[PDB]
Amino acid sequence: GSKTIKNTVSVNLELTAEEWKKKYEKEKEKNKALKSVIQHLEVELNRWRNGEAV
Amino acid sequence: GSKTIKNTVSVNLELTAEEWKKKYEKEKEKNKALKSVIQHLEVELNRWRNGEAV
């Protein structure tokens, strides 16, 4: 302990999934909503191609 | 401890974001690429409607 200057500090281990869970949770919503959009836009051409009613 | 048969086991808590991160990472790529496609196909009609050059 004697004759010691500045103590070495180790880097953080693993980040808590608490943050990963929240980000992922909302993250899935974005992609999920986007997925529906993909089908939505693709549907547009499919229904507008023949002008299908409803 | 005496007179004990079969030990009760609790269910897993929360899954590690390690797996959620990898799946989400690639997941975003799929939706991201699909998003570009949506605009791509929608662009098609927009540019082909007037036969815009380039």
Side-chain angles (χ1 to χ4, degrees):
Chain A
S2 283
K3 222 174 176 78
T4 171
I5 297 169
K6 293 176 68 177
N7 357 118
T8 309
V9 168
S10 282
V11 297
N12 66 63
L13 276 62
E14 336 104 69
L15 291 170
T16 60
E18 125 78 6
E19 260 241 46
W20 287 330
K21 209 174 186 179
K22 287 179 173 60
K23 296 296 180 179
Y24 133 58
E25 265 267 61
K26 289 180 176 63
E27 176 100 64
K28 259 291 181 177
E29 266 92 274
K30 182 66 181 178
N31 269 148
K32 185 176 68 177
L34 270 284
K35 177 58 169 299
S36 288
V37 174
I38 304 317
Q39 337 196 40
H40 220 101
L41 279 318
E42 294 299 71
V43 169
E44 266 71 293
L45 281 277
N46 165 19
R47 101 215 276 202
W48 135 48
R49 269 297 269 223
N50 273 303
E52 313 203 50
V54 170
Chain B
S2 283
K3 222 174 176 78
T4 171
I5 297 169
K6 293 176 68 177
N7 357 118
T8 309
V9 168
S10 282
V11 297
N12 66 63
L13 276 62
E14 336 105 69
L15 291 170
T16 60
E18 125 78 6
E19 260 241 46
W20 287 330
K21 209 173 186 179
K22 287 179 173 60
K23 295 296 180 179
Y24 133 58
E25 265 267 61
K26 289 180 176 63
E27 176 100 64
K28 259 291 181 177
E29 266 92 274
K30 182 66 181 178
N31 269 148
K32 185 176 68 177
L34 270 284
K35 177 58 169 299
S36 288
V37 174
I38 304 317
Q39 337 196 40
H40 220 101
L41 279 318
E42 294 299 72
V43 169
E44 266 71 293
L45 281 277
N46 165 19
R47 101 215 276 202
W48 135 48
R49 269 298 269 224
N50 273 303
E52 313 203 50
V54 170

